[PDB]
Structure 1
Amino acid sequence: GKGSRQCRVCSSHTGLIRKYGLNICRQCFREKANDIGFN
């Protein structure tokens, strides 16, 4: 109930995000903008 809460794409329990809930920017910073995250 704290620092452990996976990250959908690759469990990499370190770096996950806010509005969404997946992440990490790991599996976002090119695998989201079209998934989507425009810009």
Structure 2
Amino acid sequence: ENVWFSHPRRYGKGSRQCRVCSSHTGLIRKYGLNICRQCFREKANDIGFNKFR
């Protein structure tokens, strides 16, 4: 019961997970969007982030 998830994940690398695919790598924590670098590339257009230079 208490040991099922006893080891903390409130800090470090296990706390953050991609809000689209739950991955823990290549995350964009800046501005609090928390999408992986792979998925942000597809979602950059509709999130408002556009290429200019």
Q: TM-score range by the shorter chain?
A: 0.3 to 0.5
Using a 3 Å threshold, how does the CA distance of structure 1 residues 10 and 20 change in structure 2: closer, same or farther?
farther
Unaligned runs of 5+ in 2: 1-11
User: TM-score under structure 2 normalisation?
Assistant: 0.41
Q: Give the conservation status (yes or no) of the 8 Å contact 1:9–1:22.
A: no
Percent of matched pairs sharing the same residue: 100
Rg: which structure is higher?
A: 2
Q: Give the conservation status (yes or no) of the 8 Å contact 2:18–2:36.
A: no
More helix by share: 2
Q: CA deviation at 1:8?
A: 0.3
Cα root mean square deviation, aligned: 2.8
Could you give the per-residue CA deviations for residues 14-34 of structure 1, whole angstroms, max 9, x where no partner exists?
Answer: 111033434544443432133
Using a 3 Å threshold, how does the CA distance of structure 1 residues 28 and 2 change in structure 2: closer, same or farther?
closer
Unaligned runs of 5+ in 1: none
